[PDB]
Design a protein around this nucleic acid. Structure first.
Ligand SMILES: [Mg+2]
Ligand SMILES: [Mg+2]
Length: 300
DNA sequence: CGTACACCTGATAA
DNA sequence: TGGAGGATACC
DNA sequence: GGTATCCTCCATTAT
DNA sequence: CAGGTGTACG
């Protein structure tokens, strides 16, 4: 129903999906440079996945804090300079991210390195950090642009050929950014009136096209599509015999984490109904409507 | 009859 | 996801 | 005082 | 993230 056992690669996949490596630069006249510099490792989940966050914190030796983030989410954060260098850098240096977020990790590392020698407390170290920050995530705020107009952003790392490092990386990535979809489509030709469809789908910004492409190869099925509405891609599997013979047995062994694991189990029950051909009877169709109801957004 | 890829639309924590 | 403001602990 | 961390909340887009 | 539709094709 709910799964929180953690393997290093699953952690990496989950953070590739859900994590952020952040640097705040805050105006504050009480500091010698005029600015306060903070590095933050963050991951946020829906409140129904608190158990997952508590596992993550245990996984990182009990460091950091879990707090309400928005109406129905909770953050796990590490923001001690010292603890990030001691615990978090060595983990991600050994077990590395493979999406574009690796670029942000590596700039973030560099900041921490500067913070390590307290250079952040100097005019020069500060400027270097402003340059690093300018290329992390959303870049400089209006306030920072204005205060450091001469800042050249540091070139974003060019990290190529990033292969899926381990099957558990995929279980973790899918836990954050994947979907086990059950679809009922009105149909004029099926006797029962609706076609039951199972779709496995991974969503990701087009910046990671190469990685999305390599999933077809890695899973030996599926295809890639572009969202009409902006720079986002789906890796999709709709072919039921691929769902039965490739997707389902993969995630049976490399388990989804967090409550999405329950949704995967329910998706597998639908698949069984379909495998037995009972989806083409009113009874079978109604079992599937009831499973669907309680999965994903229907789950209590 | 029934499936599946190409295409569509909405909600929202992440 | 990625970010912010105000407060307080730490040294 | 200088510096480092805690605590609470938020807009927008990538899911 | 997730839930829907058209329609070519076996
Ligand atoms: Mg993501
Ligand atoms: Mg996500």
């Amino acid at each position: 129903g709910e799964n929180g056992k953690l393997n290093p690669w699953a952690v990496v996949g989950f953070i590739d999906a859900e994590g952020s490596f952040m640097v705040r630069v805050r105006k504050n006249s009480k500091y010698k440079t005029g600015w306060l510099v903070v590095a933050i490792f963050s991951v946020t989940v829906d409140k129904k996945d608190l158990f997952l966050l508590e596992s993550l914190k245990t996984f990182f030796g009990g460091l950091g804090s879990i707090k309400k983030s928005g109406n129905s989410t909770f953050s796990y954060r590490i923001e001690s300079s010292e603890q990030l260098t001691k615990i978090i850098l060595p983990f991600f240096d050994k077990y590395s991210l493979i999406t574009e977020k690796l670029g942000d990790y590596l700039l973030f590392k560099k900041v921490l390195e500067l913070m390590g020698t307290k250079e952040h407390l100097t005019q020069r170290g500060l400027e270097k950090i402003v340059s690093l920050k300018a290329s992390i995530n959303k870049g400089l705020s209006e306030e920072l642009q204005a205060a450091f107009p001469q800042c050249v952003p540091t070139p974003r790392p060019e990290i190529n050929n990033k292969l899926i490092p381990d099957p558990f990386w995929l279980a973790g990535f899918v836990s954050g950014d994947g979907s086990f979809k059950s679809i009922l489509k009105k149909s004029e030709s099926i006797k029962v009136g609706f076609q039951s469809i199972l779709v496995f789908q991974i969503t990701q910004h087009a910046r990671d096209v190469k990685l999305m492409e390599s999933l077809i190869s890695y899973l030996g099925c599926g295809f890639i599509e572009k969202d009409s509405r902006g720079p986002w891609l789906y890796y999709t599997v709709t072919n039921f015999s691929d769902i039965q013979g490739k997707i389902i047995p993969f995630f049976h062994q490399y388990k989804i984490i967090g409550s999405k694991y329950g949704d995967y189990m329910d998706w597998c029950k639908i698949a069984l109904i379909m495998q037995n051909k009972n989806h083409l009877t009113p009874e079978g169709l109604n079992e599937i409507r009831a499973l669907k109801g309680g999965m994903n957004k229907g789950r209590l």
